[PDB]
CSV table of C-alpha atoms in Angstrom, one decimal:
chain,number,residue,atom,x,y,z
C,1,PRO,CA,-10.3,-7.5,-1.6
C,2,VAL,CA,-10.3,-4.1,0.1
C,3,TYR,CA,-8.6,-3.8,3.5
C,4,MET,CA,-9.8,-0.7,5.3
C,5,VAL,CA,-7.1,0.1,7.9
C,6,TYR,CA,-8.1,2.5,10.7
C,7,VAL,CA,-5.0,4.1,12.4
C,8,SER,CA,-4.2,7.2,14.3
C,9,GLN,CA,-2.6,10.1,12.5
C,10,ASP,CA,1.2,10.1,12.7
C,11,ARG,CA,1.4,6.6,14.1
C,12,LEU,CA,2.8,5.0,11.0
C,13,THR,CA,5.4,6.7,8.8
C,14,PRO,CA,5.0,6.5,5.0
C,15,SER,CA,7.4,3.5,5.0
C,16,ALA,CA,5.6,1.8,7.9
C,17,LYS,CA,2.4,2.3,5.8
C,18,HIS,CA,4.1,0.6,2.9
C,19,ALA,CA,5.3,-2.1,5.3
C,20,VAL,CA,1.8,-2.7,6.7
C,21,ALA,CA,0.3,-2.7,3.2
C,22,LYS,CA,2.9,-5.2,1.9
C,23,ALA,CA,2.3,-7.5,4.9
C,24,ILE,CA,-1.5,-7.5,4.4
C,25,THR,CA,-1.1,-8.0,0.7
C,26,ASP,CA,1.5,-10.8,0.8
C,27,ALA,CA,-0.6,-12.6,3.4
C,28,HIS,CA,-3.8,-12.4,1.3
C,29,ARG,CA,-1.8,-13.4,-1.8
C,30,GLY,CA,-0.1,-16.3,0.0
C,31,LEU,CA,-3.1,-17.9,1.5
C,32,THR,CA,-5.8,-17.4,-1.3
C,33,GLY,CA,-3.9,-17.3,-4.6
C,34,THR,CA,-5.3,-13.9,-5.5
C,35,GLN,CA,-2.9,-11.8,-7.5
C,36,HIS,CA,-1.2,-8.9,-5.7
C,37,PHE,CA,-2.9,-6.2,-7.8
C,38,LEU,CA,-6.4,-7.3,-6.8
C,39,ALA,CA,-5.6,-6.4,-3.1
C,40,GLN,CA,-6.2,-2.8,-2.0
C,41,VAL,CA,-5.1,-1.5,1.4
C,42,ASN,CA,-6.7,1.8,2.2
C,43,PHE,CA,-5.4,3.6,5.3
C,44,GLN,CA,-7.9,5.8,7.2
C,45,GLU,CA,-6.2,8.2,9.6
C,46,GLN,CA,-7.9,10.0,12.4
C,47,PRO,CA,-6.5,12.1,15.2
C,48,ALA,CA,-5.4,10.1,18.3
C,49,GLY,CA,-8.1,10.1,20.9
C,50,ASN,CA,-10.8,9.2,18.4
C,51,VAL,CA,-10.7,5.5,19.4
C,52,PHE,CA,-12.6,4.5,22.6
C,53,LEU,CA,-12.4,1.0,24.2
C,54,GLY,CA,-15.0,0.3,26.9
C,55,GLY,CA,-15.5,4.0,27.2
C,56,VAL,CA,-11.8,4.8,27.8
C,57,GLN,CA,-10.2,7.2,25.3
C,58,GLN,CA,-7.2,5.6,23.7
C,59,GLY,CA,-3.8,6.9,22.7
C,60,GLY,CA,-2.9,6.1,19.1
C,61,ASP,CA,-1.7,2.5,19.0
C,62,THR,CA,-4.9,0.7,18.1
C,63,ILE,CA,-5.1,-0.8,14.6
C,64,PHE,CA,-8.4,-1.9,13.2
C,65,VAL,CA,-8.3,-4.0,10.0
C,66,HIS,CA,-11.6,-4.3,8.2
C,67,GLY,CA,-11.2,-6.8,5.4
C,68,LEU,CA,-13.8,-7.0,2.7
C,69,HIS,CA,-13.6,-10.3,0.9
C,70,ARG,CA,-15.5,-12.3,-1.7
C,71,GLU,CA,-17.6,-15.1,-0.3
C,72,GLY,CA,-16.6,-18.7,-0.9
C,73,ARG,CA,-13.6,-19.5,1.3
C,74,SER,CA,-13.6,-21.9,4.3
C,75,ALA,CA,-13.7,-20.8,7.9
C,76,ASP,CA,-10.3,-22.5,8.3
C,77,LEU,CA,-8.6,-20.4,5.6
C,78,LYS,CA,-10.2,-17.2,6.9
C,79,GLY,CA,-8.9,-17.9,10.4
C,80,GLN,CA,-5.3,-18.5,9.1
C,81,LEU,CA,-5.6,-15.3,7.1
C,82,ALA,CA,-6.7,-13.2,10.1
C,83,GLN,CA,-4.0,-14.7,12.3
C,84,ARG,CA,-1.3,-14.1,9.7
C,85,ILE,CA,-2.5,-10.5,9.4
C,86,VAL,CA,-2.3,-10.0,13.1
C,87,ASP,CA,1.2,-11.6,13.0
C,88,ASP,CA,2.6,-9.6,10.1
C,89,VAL,CA,1.0,-6.3,10.9
C,90,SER,CA,2.4,-6.5,14.4
C,91,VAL,CA,5.9,-7.1,13.0
C,92,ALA,CA,5.6,-4.6,10.2
C,93,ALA,CA,4.2,-1.8,12.4
C,94,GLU,CA,6.3,-2.6,15.5
C,95,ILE,CA,3.1,-2.6,17.6
C,96,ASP,CA,2.1,-5.2,20.1
C,97,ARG,CA,-0.6,-7.7,19.0
C,98,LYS,CA,-3.1,-6.7,21.8
C,99,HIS,CA,-3.5,-3.4,19.8
C,100,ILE,CA,-4.6,-5.2,16.6
C,101,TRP,CA,-8.3,-5.8,15.7
C,102,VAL,CA,-9.2,-7.7,12.5
C,103,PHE,CA,-12.8,-8.3,11.1
C,104,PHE,CA,-13.5,-10.0,7.8
C,105,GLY,CA,-16.7,-9.2,5.9
C,106,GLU,CA,-17.9,-11.2,2.9
C,107,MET,CA,-20.0,-10.4,-0.2
C,108,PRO,CA,-20.8,-12.3,-3.4
C,109,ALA,CA,-18.3,-11.6,-6.1
C,110,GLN,CA,-21.3,-10.8,-8.3
C,111,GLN,CA,-21.7,-7.5,-6.4
C,112,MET,CA,-18.0,-6.6,-6.2
C,113,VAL,CA,-16.2,-4.4,-8.8
C,114,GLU,CA,-12.5,-3.7,-8.9
C,115,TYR,CA,-10.8,-1.8,-11.7
C,116,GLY,CA,-14.3,-1.2,-13.1
C,117,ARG,CA,-14.8,-5.0,-13.6
C,118,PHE,CA,-16.9,-7.6,-11.7
C,119,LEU,CA,-14.8,-10.0,-9.7
C,120,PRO,CA,-14.7,-13.7,-10.4
C,121,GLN,CA,-15.3,-16.4,-7.9
C,122,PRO,CA,-12.3,-17.1,-5.7
C,123,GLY,CA,-10.6,-19.8,-7.7
C,124,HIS,CA,-11.3,-18.4,-11.2
C,125,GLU,CA,-9.1,-15.3,-11.2
C,126,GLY,CA,-6.7,-16.8,-13.7
C,127,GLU,CA,-9.1,-17.1,-16.7
C,128,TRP,CA,-10.8,-13.8,-15.6
C,129,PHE,CA,-7.5,-11.9,-16.0
C,130,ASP,CA,-7.2,-13.1,-19.6
C,131,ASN,CA,-10.4,-11.8,-21.2
C,132,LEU,CA,-9.8,-8.4,-19.8
C,133,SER,CA,-8.9,-6.0,-22.6
C,134,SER,CA,-5.1,-5.4,-23.3
C,135,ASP,CA,-5.1,-2.1,-21.5
C,136,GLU,CA,-6.9,-3.5,-18.4
C,137,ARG,CA,-4.3,-6.2,-18.2
C,138,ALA,CA,-1.4,-3.7,-18.7
C,139,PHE,CA,-2.8,-1.4,-16.1
C,140,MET,CA,-3.3,-4.0,-13.4
C,141,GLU,CA,0.1,-5.4,-14.1
C,142,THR,CA,1.8,-2.2,-12.9
C,143,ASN,CA,0.3,-2.6,-9.4
C,144,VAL,CA,2.6,-5.3,-8.0
C,145,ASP,CA,5.4,-5.1,-5.4
R,1,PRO,CA,-18.0,-5.2,18.4
R,2,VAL,CA,-16.6,-2.3,16.5
R,3,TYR,CA,-18.8,0.8,16.2
R,4,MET,CA,-17.6,3.1,13.4
R,5,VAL,CA,-19.2,6.6,14.0
R,6,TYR,CA,-19.2,9.0,11.1
R,7,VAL,CA,-19.5,12.7,12.2
R,8,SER,CA,-18.3,16.0,10.9
R,9,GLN,CA,-15.2,17.7,12.2
R,10,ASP,CA,-15.9,20.0,15.2
R,11,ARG,CA,-19.5,18.8,15.6
R,12,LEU,CA,-18.7,16.7,18.8
R,13,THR,CA,-16.5,18.2,21.5
R,14,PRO,CA,-14.1,15.8,23.2
R,15,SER,CA,-16.7,15.7,26.1
R,16,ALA,CA,-19.4,14.8,23.5
R,17,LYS,CA,-17.2,12.1,22.0
R,18,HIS,CA,-16.7,10.5,25.4
R,19,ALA,CA,-20.5,10.7,26.1
R,20,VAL,CA,-21.4,9.2,22.7
R,21,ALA,CA,-18.9,6.3,23.1
R,22,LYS,CA,-20.0,5.6,26.7
R,23,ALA,CA,-23.6,5.8,25.4
R,24,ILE,CA,-23.0,3.2,22.7
R,25,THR,CA,-20.8,1.0,24.9
R,26,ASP,CA,-23.3,0.9,27.9
R,27,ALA,CA,-26.2,0.1,25.5
R,28,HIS,CA,-24.2,-2.8,24.0
R,29,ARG,CA,-23.1,-4.1,27.4
R,30,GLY,CA,-26.6,-3.7,28.8
R,31,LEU,CA,-28.4,-5.6,26.1
R,32,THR,CA,-25.8,-8.2,25.1
R,33,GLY,CA,-23.7,-8.9,28.2
R,34,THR,CA,-20.5,-8.4,26.3
R,35,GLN,CA,-17.8,-6.9,28.6
R,36,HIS,CA,-17.1,-3.2,28.2
R,37,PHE,CA,-13.5,-3.6,27.1
R,38,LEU,CA,-14.6,-5.7,24.0
R,39,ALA,CA,-16.6,-2.8,22.6
R,40,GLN,CA,-14.7,-0.3,20.4
R,41,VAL,CA,-16.1,3.1,19.3
R,42,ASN,CA,-14.1,4.6,16.5
R,43,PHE,CA,-14.8,8.1,15.4
R,44,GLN,CA,-14.2,9.0,11.7
R,45,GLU,CA,-14.4,12.8,11.4
R,46,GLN,CA,-14.7,14.5,8.0
R,47,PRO,CA,-15.2,18.2,7.2
R,48,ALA,CA,-18.8,19.4,7.2
R,49,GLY,CA,-20.3,19.2,3.8
R,50,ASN,CA,-19.1,15.8,2.9
R,51,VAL,CA,-22.5,14.2,3.7
R,52,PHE,CA,-25.2,14.3,1.0
R,53,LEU,CA,-28.8,13.2,1.6
R,54,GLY,CA,-30.9,12.9,-1.5
R,55,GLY,CA,-28.1,14.8,-3.3
R,56,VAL,CA,-28.3,17.8,-1.0
R,57,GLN,CA,-25.2,18.8,0.8
R,58,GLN,CA,-25.6,18.7,4.6
R,59,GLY,CA,-24.2,20.8,7.4
R,60,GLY,CA,-22.4,18.8,10.1
R,61,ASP,CA,-25.2,17.3,12.1
R,62,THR,CA,-25.7,13.8,10.6
R,63,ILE,CA,-24.4,10.9,12.7
R,64,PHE,CA,-24.0,7.5,11.0
R,65,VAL,CA,-23.3,4.7,13.4
R,66,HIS,CA,-22.1,1.5,11.7
R,67,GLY,CA,-22.0,-1.4,14.1
R,68,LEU,CA,-19.9,-4.5,13.2
R,69,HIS,CA,-21.3,-7.4,15.4
R,70,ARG,CA,-20.9,-11.1,15.8
R,71,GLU,CA,-23.6,-13.3,14.4
R,72,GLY,CA,-26.0,-15.1,16.7
R,73,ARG,CA,-28.4,-12.6,18.1
R,74,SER,CA,-32.1,-12.3,17.6
R,75,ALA,CA,-33.6,-9.8,15.3
R,76,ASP,CA,-35.6,-8.5,18.3
R,77,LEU,CA,-32.4,-7.9,20.3
R,78,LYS,CA,-30.7,-6.1,17.4
R,79,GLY,CA,-33.9,-3.9,17.1
R,80,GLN,CA,-33.8,-2.9,20.8
R,81,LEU,CA,-30.1,-2.3,20.6
R,82,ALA,CA,-30.4,-0.2,17.4
R,83,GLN,CA,-33.2,1.8,19.1
R,84,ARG,CA,-31.3,2.3,22.4
R,85,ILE,CA,-28.2,3.6,20.5
R,86,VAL,CA,-30.5,6.1,18.7
R,87,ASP,CA,-32.1,7.3,22.0
R,88,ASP,CA,-28.9,7.3,24.0
R,89,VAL,CA,-26.7,8.9,21.4
R,90,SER,CA,-29.4,11.6,20.8
R,91,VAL,CA,-29.3,12.4,24.5
R,92,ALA,CA,-25.5,12.1,24.9
R,93,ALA,CA,-24.8,14.5,22.0
R,94,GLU,CA,-27.9,16.7,22.3
R,95,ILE,CA,-28.9,16.1,18.7
R,96,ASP,CA,-32.4,15.5,17.3
R,97,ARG,CA,-32.9,11.8,16.6
R,98,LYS,CA,-33.7,12.6,12.9
R,99,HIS,CA,-29.9,13.1,12.4
R,100,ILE,CA,-29.0,9.6,13.6
R,101,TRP,CA,-28.4,6.6,11.2
R,102,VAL,CA,-27.6,3.2,12.6
R,103,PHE,CA,-26.7,0.1,10.6
R,104,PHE,CA,-25.6,-3.3,12.1
R,105,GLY,CA,-23.5,-5.7,10.1
R,106,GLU,CA,-22.7,-9.2,11.4
R,107,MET,CA,-19.9,-11.7,10.8
R,108,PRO,CA,-19.0,-15.1,12.3
R,109,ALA,CA,-16.9,-14.8,15.5
R,110,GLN,CA,-14.6,-17.2,13.8
R,111,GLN,CA,-13.4,-14.4,11.5
R,112,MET,CA,-13.3,-11.6,14.1
R,113,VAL,CA,-10.2,-10.6,16.1
R,114,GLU,CA,-10.0,-8.2,19.1
R,115,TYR,CA,-6.9,-7.5,21.2
R,116,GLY,CA,-5.2,-10.0,18.9
R,117,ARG,CA,-7.4,-12.9,19.9
R,118,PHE,CA,-10.3,-14.6,18.2
R,119,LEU,CA,-13.7,-13.7,19.7
R,120,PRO,CA,-16.0,-16.3,21.2
R,121,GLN,CA,-19.7,-16.8,20.4
R,122,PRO,CA,-22.0,-14.2,22.1
R,123,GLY,CA,-22.9,-16.1,25.2
R,124,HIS,CA,-19.4,-17.4,26.0
R,125,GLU,CA,-17.6,-14.2,26.9
R,126,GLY,CA,-17.1,-15.5,30.5
R,127,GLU,CA,-15.2,-18.7,29.7
R,128,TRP,CA,-13.2,-16.9,27.0
R,129,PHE,CA,-11.9,-14.3,29.4
R,130,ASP,CA,-11.0,-17.0,31.9
R,131,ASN,CA,-8.4,-18.4,29.5
R,132,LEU,CA,-6.5,-15.3,28.6
R,133,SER,CA,-3.0,-14.6,29.8
R,134,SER,CA,-2.6,-12.6,33.0
R,135,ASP,CA,-1.1,-9.7,31.0
R,136,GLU,CA,-4.0,-9.9,28.4
R,137,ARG,CA,-6.6,-9.7,31.1
R,138,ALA,CA,-4.8,-6.8,32.8
R,139,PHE,CA,-4.4,-4.8,29.6
R,140,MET,CA,-8.1,-5.5,28.9
R,141,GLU,CA,-9.4,-4.5,32.4
R,142,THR,CA,-7.9,-1.1,32.0
R,143,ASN,CA,-10.4,-0.3,29.2
R,144,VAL,CA,-13.5,0.0,31.3
R,145,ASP,CA,-15.3,3.3,32.1
F,1,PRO,CA,-28.8,3.1,1.9
F,2,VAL,CA,-25.5,4.7,2.9
F,3,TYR,CA,-22.7,5.0,0.2
F,4,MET,CA,-19.3,5.4,1.8
F,5,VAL,CA,-17.0,7.0,-0.8
F,6,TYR,CA,-13.3,6.8,-0.2
F,7,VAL,CA,-11.4,9.4,-2.3
F,8,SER,CA,-8.2,11.3,-1.9
F,9,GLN,CA,-8.0,14.8,-0.4
F,10,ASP,CA,-8.4,17.6,-3.0
F,11,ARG,CA,-9.2,15.2,-5.8
F,12,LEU,CA,-12.9,16.3,-5.8
F,13,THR,CA,-13.9,19.9,-5.7
F,14,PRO,CA,-17.1,20.8,-3.9
F,15,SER,CA,-19.0,20.8,-7.2
F,16,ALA,CA,-17.5,17.4,-8.2
F,17,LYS,CA,-18.4,15.9,-4.9
F,18,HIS,CA,-22.0,17.1,-5.6
F,19,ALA,CA,-22.0,15.5,-9.1
F,20,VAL,CA,-20.7,12.2,-7.8
F,21,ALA,CA,-23.2,12.3,-5.0
F,22,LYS,CA,-26.0,13.0,-7.5
F,23,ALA,CA,-24.8,10.3,-9.9
F,24,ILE,CA,-25.0,7.7,-7.1
F,25,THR,CA,-28.3,8.9,-5.6
F,26,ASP,CA,-29.9,9.0,-9.1
F,27,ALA,CA,-28.5,5.6,-10.1
F,28,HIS,CA,-29.8,4.1,-6.8
F,29,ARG,CA,-33.2,5.8,-7.1
F,30,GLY,CA,-33.7,4.9,-10.8
F,31,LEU,CA,-32.9,1.3,-10.3
F,32,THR,CA,-34.4,0.6,-6.9
F,33,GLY,CA,-37.2,3.1,-6.5
F,34,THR,CA,-36.1,4.2,-3.0
F,35,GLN,CA,-36.8,7.9,-2.5
F,36,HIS,CA,-34.0,10.3,-3.0
F,37,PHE,CA,-33.9,11.4,0.6
F,38,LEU,CA,-33.2,7.9,1.9
F,39,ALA,CA,-29.9,7.7,0.0
F,40,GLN,CA,-26.9,9.0,1.9
F,41,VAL,CA,-23.5,9.7,0.2
F,42,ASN,CA,-20.7,10.1,2.7
F,43,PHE,CA,-17.3,11.2,1.4
F,44,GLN,CA,-14.3,10.0,3.3
F,45,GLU,CA,-11.2,11.8,2.2
F,46,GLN,CA,-7.6,10.8,3.1
F,47,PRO,CA,-4.3,12.2,2.0
F,48,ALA,CA,-3.1,10.9,-1.4
F,49,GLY,CA,-0.7,8.0,-0.9
F,50,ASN,CA,-2.9,6.2,1.7
F,51,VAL,CA,-4.1,3.8,-1.0
F,52,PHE,CA,-1.9,0.8,-1.9
F,53,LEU,CA,-2.7,-1.5,-4.8
F,54,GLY,CA,-0.7,-4.7,-4.9
F,55,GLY,CA,1.4,-3.0,-2.3
F,56,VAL,CA,2.1,-0.1,-4.7
F,57,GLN,CA,1.2,3.3,-3.3
F,58,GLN,CA,-1.3,5.2,-5.5
F,59,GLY,CA,-1.7,8.9,-6.4
F,60,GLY,CA,-5.0,10.4,-5.6
F,61,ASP,CA,-7.0,8.8,-8.5
F,62,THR,CA,-8.6,5.7,-6.9
F,63,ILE,CA,-12.2,5.8,-5.8
F,64,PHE,CA,-13.7,3.1,-3.6
F,65,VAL,CA,-17.5,3.1,-3.2
F,66,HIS,CA,-18.8,0.8,-0.4
F,67,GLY,CA,-22.6,0.5,-0.7
F,68,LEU,CA,-24.5,-0.5,2.4
F,69,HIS,CA,-27.9,-1.8,1.3
F,70,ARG,CA,-31.0,-3.5,2.6
F,71,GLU,CA,-31.3,-7.1,1.7
F,72,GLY,CA,-33.9,-8.3,-0.8
F,73,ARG,CA,-32.8,-7.3,-4.3
F,74,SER,CA,-31.8,-9.7,-7.1
F,75,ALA,CA,-28.2,-10.2,-8.0
F,76,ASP,CA,-29.1,-8.9,-11.5
F,77,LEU,CA,-30.5,-5.6,-10.1
F,78,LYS,CA,-27.4,-5.2,-8.0
F,79,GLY,CA,-25.2,-5.9,-11.0
F,80,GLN,CA,-27.1,-3.2,-12.9
F,81,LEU,CA,-26.7,-0.8,-10.0
F,82,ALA,CA,-23.0,-1.4,-9.5
F,83,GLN,CA,-22.3,-1.0,-13.2
F,84,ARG,CA,-24.3,2.2,-13.5
F,85,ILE,CA,-22.6,3.7,-10.4
F,86,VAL,CA,-19.2,2.9,-12.0
F,87,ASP,CA,-20.4,4.5,-15.3
F,88,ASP,CA,-22.0,7.6,-13.8
F,89,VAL,CA,-19.3,8.2,-11.3
F,90,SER,CA,-16.7,8.0,-14.1
F,91,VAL,CA,-18.4,10.8,-15.9
F,92,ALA,CA,-19.2,12.9,-12.9
F,93,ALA,CA,-15.7,12.8,-11.3
F,94,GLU,CA,-14.0,12.7,-14.8
F,95,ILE,CA,-12.0,9.6,-13.8
F,96,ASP,CA,-11.2,6.5,-15.8
F,97,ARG,CA,-13.3,3.5,-14.9
F,98,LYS,CA,-10.2,1.5,-14.1
F,99,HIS,CA,-9.9,3.6,-10.9
F,100,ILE,CA,-13.3,2.8,-9.6
F,101,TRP,CA,-14.0,0.0,-7.0
F,102,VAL,CA,-17.6,-0.6,-5.9
F,103,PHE,CA,-18.6,-3.2,-3.2
F,104,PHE,CA,-22.2,-3.7,-1.9
F,105,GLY,CA,-22.8,-5.1,1.6
F,106,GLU,CA,-26.4,-6.1,2.5
F,107,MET,CA,-28.2,-6.2,5.9
F,108,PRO,CA,-31.7,-6.9,7.0
F,109,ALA,CA,-33.8,-3.7,7.0
F,110,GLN,CA,-34.9,-4.7,10.6
F,111,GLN,CA,-31.4,-3.7,11.8
F,112,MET,CA,-31.1,-0.5,9.6
F,113,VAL,CA,-32.1,2.9,10.9
F,114,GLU,CA,-32.3,6.2,8.9
F,115,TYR,CA,-33.5,9.5,10.2
F,116,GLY,CA,-34.0,7.7,13.6
F,117,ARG,CA,-36.5,5.2,12.2
F,118,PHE,CA,-36.3,1.6,11.2
F,119,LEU,CA,-36.3,1.1,7.4
F,120,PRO,CA,-38.9,-1.0,5.6
F,121,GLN,CA,-38.4,-3.9,3.2
F,122,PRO,CA,-37.4,-2.8,-0.3
F,123,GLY,CA,-40.5,-1.8,-2.3
F,124,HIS,CA,-42.5,-0.8,0.8
F,125,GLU,CA,-41.0,2.7,0.9
F,126,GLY,CA,-44.3,4.4,0.0
F,127,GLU,CA,-46.6,3.2,2.8
F,128,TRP,CA,-43.7,3.6,5.2
F,129,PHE,CA,-43.4,7.3,4.4
F,130,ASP,CA,-47.0,8.1,5.3
F,131,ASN,CA,-47.2,6.7,8.8
F,132,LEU,CA,-44.2,8.8,9.6
F,133,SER,CA,-45.2,11.9,11.5
F,134,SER,CA,-45.7,15.2,9.7
F,135,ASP,CA,-42.4,16.7,10.9
F,136,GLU,CA,-40.4,13.6,10.0
F,137,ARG,CA,-41.8,13.5,6.5
F,138,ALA,CA,-41.1,17.3,6.3
F,139,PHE,CA,-37.4,17.1,7.4
F,140,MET,CA,-36.9,14.2,4.9
F,141,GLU,CA,-38.6,16.1,2.0
F,142,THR,CA,-36.0,18.9,2.2
F,143,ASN,CA,-33.3,16.4,1.3
F,144,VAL,CA,-34.3,16.1,-2.4
F,145,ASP,CA,-32.3,17.6,-5.3
């Protein structure tokens, strides 16, 4: 998947960014089976005051997670995954849960490309990994924490 | 909903950001009934010259509104809401409507979290707000302009 | 369409941004037939280190293209469009394909607005253009390269 994470500049230190990425990644790995290296977390920083809620300019505590997923999982799994992200981003960022927004969007794997390769359907990532060329496997392997 | 608003750096003054947010938020409330505090406007500023139309680098005048909505509304309602955002943002920011792009994406409310809580379906915002904590309602009430 | 392109700061020069924007616009136009001026490429730059793969912070090499399309095209056409974007962007940015992520999201044209006007169904771009007013057609025409 790709998790776009919209935060205010200077709200998360580099280590807090690492912590937030590891929380989102571990959650997605834990609940779906997808290997760590297929999960990207992409922080998008904007000056504080760029978020408005109901017309009121905000400080810099709001966190918006936009999660882009392959189609094919159940509503039940997706709810657990969103709740676990709320949970673990709150702990990892030391920010209260009422600041955390999480939307999941879904697309057919047939129109999703990671590492220059089309994604498999959500249960099939094991065989998929194996007919990647040598180098592709070696490269992805290095992206695991 | 979350409205992501893609604009160039220094194109909108802070007063214009407030007026554009208010404009999007009032149109959304006026046409859907969703309470003000549930509508987020998130400005993503980039240096002018980062937008290309037909391969031709632009100045800093294009505005792309990307609305992330719950599923359940009619095509006619989304059409009126898209058009009102066009008209009202054009007025708020004093920009010709030909600079304004607006896309709506929808997701099930079941996979959509705001203020740390799962959203209801689009007609049930009343019941939903009546079963939040006292604190949660209070934090939420402060985000109305 | 709108192509959101997430790249690291100072990884693409002005000229490289242009080439990547031309690669995408040409790939889209070749394969779909949509006029050049209807294809927006919108570069979102963030400091290097804001991208985490498997929870591993990246340099500034990763590119994520998020395509926002009208519904109505075949899975095979979109597979050819995604592959050609990956290929052409690889040459134009001088970046290995293993760094390129491409996702397509689709929405009904009835909730999609470009240049302040609702988009037509795919394939209906020609007739659509002529019942635009003279000045709208004229502003649009200037965005071809």
